[PDB]
Write a protein that binds this ligand. Structure first.
Ligand SMILES: OC[C@H]1O[C@@H](O)[C@H](O)[C@@H](O)[C@@H]1O
Ligand SMILES: OC[C@H]1O[C@@H](O)[C@H](O)[C@@H](O)[C@@H]1O
Ligand SMILES: OC[C@H]1O[C@@H](O)[C@H](O)[C@@H](O)[C@@H]1O
Ligand SMILES: OC[C@H]1O[C@@H](O)[C@H](O)[C@@H](O)[C@@H]1O
Ligand SMILES: OC[C@H]1O[C@@H](O)[C@H](O)[C@@H](O)[C@@H]1O
Ligand SMILES: OC[C@H]1O[C@@H](O)[C@H](O)[C@@H](O)[C@@H]1O
Ligand SMILES: OC[C@H]1O[C@@H](O)[C@H](O)[C@@H](O)[C@@H]1O
Ligand SMILES: OC[C@H]1O[C@@H](O)[C@H](O)[C@@H](O)[C@@H]1O
Lengths: 659, 659
C-alpha cells in the first residue's frame, strides 16, 4: 500500500470508510464503499441557504454515476461479489472499482472528472464473462433531498449515424437561487444498429432511470461508458439546454478523444512534482497532498478552493485565508497559473470588499472572513470571526504582492495587484488608531488564534497590516504612482510587543493561555517580520506546547516544521512534519481530517501547509522580497536520501537536496 | 409593377399572400391582407422560451395597429370594399392601404415604424367622403397567445390644452422573463374641445379597445392618427411607465414633427444607393434588398439582425454568421455605422464567448453558433451545429478586422477589435491539433456545408481559422504589440487539401457528395485565400452542380455570381445572380424565402449575399488587405446599361460602371 502514484483499498469496510475524491476544480465526486455508486457530488460556484450556519452553502448534488448491474436478473451486492478492490490513480484522477461476480464475470469501472471539460464526468465499465450471461444495466438519477421542484426527462437525439439517449433532470436549490441541470448518456462501441434499446422508468417522484439488457458470450469483454454533464444557472443562463448540449458534444467526441485530453491535462499538472527517496510512505502522502490541491483548483479561472476543496460541504464551500496563506503559496511556486486563479477570485470580488468596508465604517476594501459567490461576508452570525477577524484583508494583499514577486508580471500588477493593494492599504490606514505615544494600534479583533476574541494588537493581525501597508507602498513605487506617505508612517509604528522573557506577545491580554493554532510564530513564517534566529527559536519554545492535542486544526505544526528546517534542526523539523498530518488521517486512503483524530476529510488547507513544510522548509525555497524564488539553508529528515522538486517558478527550475 | 421605389399589390389574395415588413431595427410590423390590420409585430432584443427549438426566441407581440372601421354601423371587411390596394414605399418605409367603401368614402391608411424613435409606431388614417356618413373607429389591443398575465388599462392624460386617452396593456413572455408594455393614443387635428369622446371597453380576458364616433359631411376629408409605443424590461427597467411616457411624448411632438424626423433619417439611409439602368425589375429588386437591410439594422446600437431580421420568428431571432459574412459586408461599404452596431453586438458578448470556450475545453473566446440576449449558445440541442459548427468564431474575427480595414479607426481597434481578435485567435490556437507531419488539423466539426457532420479539416472552417490567426497578428502590429509567434506558425500550416483533379477538397471524407451550400468556394470569396483564377474556376466547375434545387438556402449562388464577375464572365455571373433569389420570391411584394420555392420570408441573409454579388461582383468593389475600398476588374449583365453605387467607404465615393 506504498505505491507512489496509487491509493488502494481491499474490500472497502462501510463501518470505517472515508471516500476519496476525483475532481477537475469544478465537480468533485466522493467515493462510496458500495460498488458502482458514488457517495456525494459537489459543484463549485453553486451556493444557497442550506443547513449549517444559516448562510450560503455548497449543496449535495446529483449522484449522477449511480448504476445497478444485474447478471441474469441477480443484482450485484456486497454479499455476492469477491476480490472487491478500489484504487485512486493520482497520475490521472481515475477512481477504479473491480470485483468478481460469483464464478460468472469480472467487472472493472473507472470514473473521471474530465480535466479539460469542467462540467463533464465519464465512467467506463468493462465486463469479462467466464460463462454466457445477460447483463441488465440501470443508471439512476435520484434528486437529492437538497434540491426541489425537479423534473425528469428522457429523449433520443438522432441522425443517420447515432442514437444518443439522454437521461436529464432539472431541479432547484432550496430558496430557488440556482437551477441545476444534469444530463447522462450511454456510449456504446457497437454502433447505432447494434446498440441495446434504452428504456426509461419514472416510478418515483425523486428518481428516474434508463436501462438496457446485453447478452455477452463466454470469454468475451463488453465495455460501455456513462457520460454525464452537471451545470447550474451560476455557470450558464440556460443550464437545461447546456447540459444536454454538453453530453451530446462529449458523446460525439467519444471515449478515446475525451480520455486523451484528460490525460494530457493531468500530465501537464504533474510536470511540477515532489520526489522523495528513502521514504515510500512520505512519497505517497506528498503525492496525495499535490493530487488534492491539483484536483481542487483550476488554471485560467476565478475559482478559489474552500478548506475542504470539492471533497464535500466542509465550511459550506466558503473561501477563507486558507487559500491565501495555506493553499496559495505551494501552488504559486509549482503552477503560478493556479495561484493566478486564486487571486483572480479576490480581484473580481474587490467591489464587495469595498461595500463591506463602508458598511463597517472603514475605507478601502475589507475582504470578508468567509466568501462565496458575491464576495460579501458569508460567515455564520453566531461566529464572531465574521465581524471581528480582520487579518483576512492583509492575507489577500500578501498573496497579491507574492503573485507579482514570483511572476514579475507588471501588467498584472497595474491591472489587478495594485487595485487590491491600494484598497486594502486604505482599509488598514482607516482601521488603526494612533495612541498618545504615537504608536498605531488595531483594537478589538479576533486573533488568528481564534480562541482569543475581542482583544487588542494581535501579533498576526498587526503583522499582516504592516505587510499590507509596506507591499502597497512598494507596489506604488514599481508602477510610478504616488502612495500616501501615511502608509509607511503607520507600518513603521504598528505595535508588536514582547513579554518579559523576550517572547512575541500574541495579544495585549496574552500571558500563557492555550492557543488554537499558530499566530505569533506566523510573524517568522510566512510574514518574515521576525528574521532573528534567536527570536524565532524563543517564540517556538514558548508557543509550541500551547496548542492542545484535541480540536485544533492542521494550521500550526507545518509552520513549526518549516521554521525548524530553516533553523537546520532535522529532528524537530521531521517531528513536526509527521505531527502536522499523520494524526489526522482517515482510512482506507489516508485522507486528511481538520483536527487530530477528526472524521471530516479532506482538509485541503492542511495539505497546503504541509506542502509549504516540504517545499519552503525541507527544500529551503523562498519568495525573495526583491523578486523571484531563492533557496535558503535547510535540512532533510534523517531517513530522506534525496528530495527533488520540479517545475519551480516561471523558469520551471528543478531543486535537488541531499544530506 | 416596376416602380423603382414602390412595391404594389392590387386586391390582396389571403390564399396566396406574404406580408411586407416596416421596421426601424427595433420593431418590425408585418402586413396583413386584411384592411387596417397587421399580421405580426416583433420586438428586437426580447427573447424567451417559446415553441421552436426549446431555446430562447422572439415572441409574437401586440398587433397594436389593429383597427375596426364602420360606416353608418356597417363593418369594413375584405368582402365589402373595392379598388383595394396595398403599397410599400421603400423611400420612407411607409406601408399604405387604400380602398373604396360602397358609395360613402375612400379610405387611405399609412403606417410607419418611426425611424428616429425605436419604440414608437404611427398610423395615419384619411377618410374622403362621397356622401354624409358616420364612422365608428375602434383600436384593439389583443394580448397574443404568446403572452400571459395581461392587464388592460385606460386613462386620460389632461391639461388645459390636451386630453390624451391612453390604451395600455402590460403582459409577460411565457416564462415571465420579460414584461412587455404597449400604450396607444388617438391624435386629432381638431383639438381638445372638438375631438371625439373616447370610450373604453374591456369585454374579453385578452382584448380591450378604445373607440369613437365621428359624423363627416359629404365631400369632406377627416384624418386622425394612431400612435403606439411598445417596449419591454429587456429595454428599460419600468416598461409600463416608459410606454405611457413615450406615447404622451409622441402625441405632444405631433404627427408633422414625427414624420419629418422619420423622413430625414430615411433620406440619410438612401444617400447610399444602387441605381441600375436598363433593367427596371433588377432596380426594384435591389432596392427591396437595401430597404430590408436598412429596416432590419440600426446605427449607434449593439443590435444585430437574425437571418429573417424583424420579418417574423425565423430561426428564433438568433444571430448567426449570417450577420458577419452575409449582411455585414454590404452594410460596411454603404453605412459603416450599421456594420459598427453589428460588430458591437459581438464585442458586448465577448465574455459569454469566453465562458463558452471554457465550458467546451478551449482558450480565448468561442462565439456561439446561435446568439441572443446573453451571447451564450442558443442553438437547439438536436442541431449538432450548436456543439460542432465552430467557424462562427473565425467569422466574427474576419468582420472585426474588415471593420478596421474600411474605417481605419485605430481607437476602435485598440478598445474593441483587438479584444475580439486576440481572444478568437487564442481559441483557434487551442482548437488545432498538430499531426506527425507538423501540419495543424481542426478535427470533428460540422462544415459550412452543414450536410457534412462530424468530419475533419473542413475547407471553410480551416480557412476562417487561418484568417483569424493572420488578422489577429496584423492587428497586434498596428497596436505595437508582439503577437504570439505560434499564431503565424499555426496559420501557415493549417491543412487545406486538394483532390486528384486539383479541386479544393471540402473535408477529409469528401469525394463527390451533394453539398448544402458554398463551402470550398468561400475560400475564393470572401476569404480570398484562393486568388489563382484557374484554381477559382476549377473549384466553381466541380462544386457549382453539387447544390441541389430543393431545401438549399440562399447562401451559394450570390458567391458564384460574384466569382464569375471577378473572372469577367458576364453570362455566368448574371445566370447565378438571378438564380440566387428569383426562384425564392413570394407574392405579392417579391419578398425572399430561404430556399427555392420556400414560404418563410424574409431571408435577409439572402439579400445580403445578393447585394455582395452586385457591389463586390458587378461593381468590383473590394476590401483592400492594406486598408480602404479598392475596385478590381468586373463585368455587368449584358442588359445593364449602367450600374451606379453611391456612399461607398468613409470618403462616400460614387462608382459608375458601363460596358
Ligand atoms: O469523434 C472524434 C473523432 O472525429 C474524427 O473525425 C477524427 O478523425 C478523430 O481523430 C476524432 O477522435
Ligand atoms: O479552515 C477554516 C477555518 O477553520 C478554523 O478552525 C481556523 O481557526 C481558521 O483559521 C480557518 O480559517
Ligand atoms: O464558519 C463559522 C466559523 O466556524 C468556526 O469553527 C471557525 O473556527 C471560524 O473560522 C468560522 O468562521
Ligand atoms: O477548537 C475548535 C473550536 O474552535 C473555535 O475557535 C470555533 O469557534 C469552534 O467552532 C470550534 O469548535
Ligand atoms: O409640438 C412640436 C412643435 O412644438 C412647437 O413648440 C415648435 O415650434 C414646432 O416646431 C414643433 O413642431
Ligand atoms: O440562416 C441560418 C442558418 O441556416 C442554415 O440553413 C445554413 O446552413 C446556415 O449556414 C445558416 O447560418
Ligand atoms: O436552429 C437549429 C439549426 O437549424 C438548422 O435548420 C440550421 O441548418 C442550423 O444552422 C441551425 O443551427
Ligand atoms: O436542407 C435543409 C436541412 O439542412 C440541414 O442541414 C438542417 O439540419 C435541417 O434542419 C434542414 O431541414
Amino acid at each position: 500500500h506504498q505505491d507512489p502514484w496509487k491509493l488502494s483499498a481491499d474490500k472497502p469496510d462501510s463501518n470505517n470508510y472515508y471516500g476519496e475524491t476525483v475532481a477537475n476544480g469544478m465537480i468533485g465526486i466522493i467515493s462510496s464503499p458500495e460498488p458502482l455508486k458514488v457517495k456525494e457530488v459537489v459543484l463549485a460556484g453553486t451556493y444557497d441557504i442550506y443547513k449549517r450556519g444559516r448562510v450560503s452553502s455548497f449543496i449535495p448534488n446529483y449522484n449522477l454515476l449511480n448504476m445497478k448491474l444485474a447478471f441474469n436478473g441477480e443484482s450485484v451486492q456486497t454479499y455476492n461479489i469477491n476480490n472487491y478492490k478500489q484504487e485512486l490513480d493520482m497520475r490521472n484522477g481515475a477512481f477504479t472499482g473491480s470485483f468478481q461476480f460469483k464464478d460468472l464475470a469480472t467487472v472493472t469501472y473507472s470514473y473521471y472528472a474530465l480535466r479539460h471539460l469542467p462540467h463533464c464526468i465519464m465512467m467506463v465499465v468493462n465486463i469479462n464473462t467466464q460463462k454466457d450471461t445477460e447483463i441488465n444495466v440501470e443508471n439512476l438519477l435520484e434528486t437529492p433531498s437538497s434540491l426541489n421542484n425537479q423534473q425528469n426527462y428522457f429523449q433520443n437525439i438522432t441522425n443517420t449515424h447515432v442514437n444518443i439517449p439522454l437521461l436529464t433532470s432539472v431541479a432547484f436549490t432550496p430558496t430557488g437561487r440556482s437551477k441545476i441541470a444534469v444530463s447522462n448518456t450511454f456510449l456504446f462501441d457497437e454502433g447505432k444498429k447494434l446498440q441495446p434499446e434504452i428504456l426509461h422508468r419514472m416510478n418515483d417522484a425523486d428518481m428516474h432511470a434508463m436501462s438496457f439488457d446485453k447478452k455477452i458470450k463466454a470469454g468475451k469483454t463488453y465495455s460501455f461508458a456513462l457520460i454525464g454533464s452537471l451545470i447550474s444557472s451560476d455557470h450558464i443562463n440556460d443550464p437545461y439546454n447546456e447540459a444536454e448540449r454538453l453530453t451530446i458534444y462529449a458523446a460525439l467526441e467519444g471515449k478515446s478523444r475525451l480520455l486523451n485530453r484528460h490525460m494530457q491535462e493531468w500530465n501537464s499538472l504533474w510536470q511540477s512534482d515532489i520526489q522523495v527517496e528513502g521514504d515510500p510512505q512520505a512519497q505517497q502522502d506528498i503525492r496525495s497532498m499535490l493530487y488534492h490541491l491539483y484536483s481542487f483548483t483550476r488554471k485560467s479561472t476565478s475559482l478559489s478552493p474552500s478548506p475542504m476543496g470539492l471533497s464535500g460541504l466542509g465550511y459550506n464551500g466558503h473561501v477563507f485565508w486558507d487559500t491565501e496563506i495555506w493553499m496559495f503559496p505551494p501552488m504559486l511556486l509549482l503552477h503560478p497559473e493556479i495561484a493566478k486563479s486564486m487571486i483572480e477570485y479576490r480581484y473580481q470580488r474587490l467591489d464587495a470588499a469595498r461595500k463591506k468596508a463602508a458598511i463597517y465604517g472603514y475605507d478601502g476594501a475589507m475582504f470578508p472572513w468567509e466568501s462565496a459567490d458575491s464576495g460579501a461576508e458569508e460567515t455564520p452570525v453566531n461566529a464572531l470571526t465574521g465581524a471581528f477577524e480582520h487579518h483576512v484583508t492583509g492575507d489577500v494583499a500578501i498573496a497579491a504582492w507574492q503573485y507579482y514577486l514570483v511572476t514579475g508580471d507588471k501588467e498584472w500588477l497595474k491591472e489587478k495587484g495594485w487595485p487590491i493593494l491600494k484598497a486594502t492599504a486604505e482599509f488598514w490606514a482607516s482601521r488603526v488608531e494612533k495612541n498618545d505615544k504615537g504608536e498605531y494600534e488595531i483594537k478589538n479583533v479576533v486573533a488568528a488564534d481564534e480562541w482569543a476574541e475581542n482583544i487588542d494588537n494581535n501579533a498576526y493581525t498587526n503583522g499582516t497590516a504592516i505587510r499590507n501597508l509596506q507591499y502597497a507602498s512598494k507596489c506604488a513605487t514599481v508602477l510610478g504612482v504616488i502612495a500616501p506617505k501615511e502608509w509607511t508612517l503607520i507600518a513603521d509604528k504598528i505595535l508588536i510587543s514582547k513579554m518579559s522573557n523576550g517572547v512575541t506577545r500574541e495579544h495585549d491580554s496574552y500571558t500563557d493561555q492555550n492557543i488554537k493554532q499558530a499566530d505569533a510564530n506566523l510573524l517568522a513564517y510566512p510574514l518574515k517580520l521576525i528574521t532573528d534566529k534567536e527570536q524565532i527559536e524563543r517564540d517556538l519554545k514558548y508557543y509550541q506546547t500551547k496548542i492542545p492535542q484535541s480540536d485544533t486544526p492542521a494550521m500550526t505544526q507545518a509552520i513549526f516544521s518549516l521554521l525548524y528546517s530553516r533553523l537546520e534542526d532535522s529532528d524537530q523539523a521531521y517531528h513536526w512534519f509527521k505531527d502536522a498530518y499523520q494524526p489526522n488521517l482517515n482510512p482506507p486512503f489516508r485522507v486528511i481530517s481538520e483536527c487530530k483524530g477528526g472524521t471530516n476529510p479532506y482538509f485541503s488547507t492542511g495539505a497546503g501547509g504541509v506542502l509549504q513544510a516540504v517545499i519552503m522548509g525541507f527544500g529551503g525555497l523562498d519568495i525573495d522580497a526583491a523578486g523571484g524564488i531563492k533557496q535558503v539553508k535547510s535540512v532533510l529528515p534523517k531517513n530522506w536520501k534525496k528530495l527533488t522538486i520540479t517545475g519551480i517558478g516561471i523558469e520551471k527550475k528543478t531543486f535537488v537536496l541531499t544530506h
